[PDB]
């Protein structure tokens, strides 16, 4: 149905409810949150975050390798929450292979 998203952003924590059928980024936008993005199509590092707690569905993304996913990397424009989750945002500059 919908779940609780906690985002840890540079300027502060913010929470909001997100339907299992809406991407994290879009939901955040809708609540009035400004998150970084560029392509909006899952093929770049711009909207990257690090999943701290919880599960996500990242099938629509195509840029990260299985290893990176395993490391806990997430592309917020292409991720659906499958449970409540905590995510650290604005991590593009920390990404490595
Ligand atoms: S903005 Fe490019 S993958 Fe999300």
Swiss-Prot record:
Q: How is the cofactor bound?
A: Binds 1 [2Fe-2S] cluster.
Q: Name one GO cellular component term.
A: chloroplast stroma
Give the principal location in a single coarse category: plastid
- Could you tell me one molecular function GO term of this UniProt entry? metal ion binding
Q: Which UniProt keywords apply?
A: 2Fe-2S, Chloroplast, Electron transport, Iron, Iron-sulfur, Metal-binding, Plastid, Transit peptide, Transport
Specify whether Chloroplast is a keyword of the entry: yes
Locations listed in the record: Plastid, Chloroplast
One Gene Ontology BP term is: electron transport chain
Tell me its cofactors: [2Fe-2S] cluster
Reported function: Ferredoxins are iron-sulfur proteins that transfer electrons in a wide variety of metabolic reactions.
Q: Record's family?
A: Belongs to the 2Fe2S plant-type ferredoxin family.
Q: How does it assemble?
A: Forms a complex with heterodimeric ferredoxin-thioredoxin reductase (FTR) and thioredoxin.
**What is the protein name given in its UniProt record?**
Ferredoxin-1, chloroplastic
Which part of the full protein is shown? 51 to 147 of 147
